[PDB]
């Protein structure tokens, strides 16, 4: 999944956890590692909800 330059990505949390979350970025789900509470914990759950 390639996110174009300028796209609005998820807001980085201030906490210092490294959760793995999958977020829909336009056409496809991309993995985000950090203090993220949004998106989905399972890639397939993101994918069936992407686009949105």
């Amino acid at each position: 999944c390639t996110v174009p330059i300028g796209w609005s990505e998820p807001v980085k949390g201030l906490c210092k956890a490294r959760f793995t979350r999958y977020y829909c970025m336009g056409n496809c789900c991309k993995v985000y590692e950090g203090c993220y509470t949004g998106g989905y914990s399972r890639m397939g759950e993101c994918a069936r909800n992407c686009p949105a």
């Binding site: 201030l14 906490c15 210092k16 956890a17 490294r18 793995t20 590692e33 950090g34 203090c35």
Partner: protein, 223 residues
């Protein structure tokens, strides 16, 4: 840990990795059946990994133990991160040895200027991502409350302190949360939050463990 160095295998024997299929937070072993971490690290399905150095290679000193209880502070506030502390009970007791050892709780709070040791398997880059195999370490001073509030006005409670650097380049980072800040042989802090990592004028913020001695004791006694 950004701007730090290699601790050396099992030299931080109270350091644990919290794993849920991957490393997501650290913690600190405080007795054979209890770990201290951050409340914001709470999730289902936690395995505690003690005795780790390289978290991606079995080196033989690991103990893998499920978290049987994961107990956030009841007054943890997920918006302000006040009371950012959690206790994890181990399903079976750790076998304490030279590589897996508890860290003493504080009897009193630490003072500004004290150099502490902060450790973890978090990101080593302040922009982009590089997660280490082996445990990383940073020596960092406790900053004054007024300096902490200058950096983070309106955001610092009595249960938080700042430690690190104001000029950038040295900090804890994502993946270090929940892990130790040890000062003078005592667990004084828990890696909690900051404005990014290793940014100018934005030191790391840590849960102030000395305020929670009674809660920790009572929680352990009652669970």
């Amino acid at each position: 840990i950004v701007g730090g160095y290699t601790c050396g295998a099992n030299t931080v024997p109270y350091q644990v990795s919290l794993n849920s299929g991957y490393h997501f937070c650290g913690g600190s072993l405080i007795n054979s059946q209890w770990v201290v971490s951050a409340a914001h690290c709470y999730k289902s399905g936690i395995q505690v990994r003690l005795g780790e150095d390289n978290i991606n290679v079995v080196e033989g000193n690991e103990q893998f133990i499920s978290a049987s209880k994961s107990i956030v502070h009841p007054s943890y506030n997920s918006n302000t991160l006040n009371n950012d502390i959690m206790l994890i009970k181990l399903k079976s007791a750790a076998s304490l040895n030279s590589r897996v050892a508890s860290i003493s709780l504080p009897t009193s709070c630490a003072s500004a200027g004290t150099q502490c040791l902060i450790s973890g398997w978090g990101n080593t880059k302040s922009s982009g991502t590089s997660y280490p195999d082996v445990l990383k370490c940073l020596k960092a001073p406790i900053l004054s409350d007024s300096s902490c509030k200058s950096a983070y006005p309106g955001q610092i409670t009595s249960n938080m302190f700042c430690a690190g650097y104001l000029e950038g380049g040295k900090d804890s980072c994502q993946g270090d949360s929940g892990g130790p800040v040890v000062c003078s042989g005592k667990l004084q802090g828990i890696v909690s939050w900051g404005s990014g990592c290793a940014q100018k004028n934005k030191p790391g913020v840590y849960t102030k463990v000395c305020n929670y001695v009674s809660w920790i004791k009572q929680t352990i006694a009652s669970n």
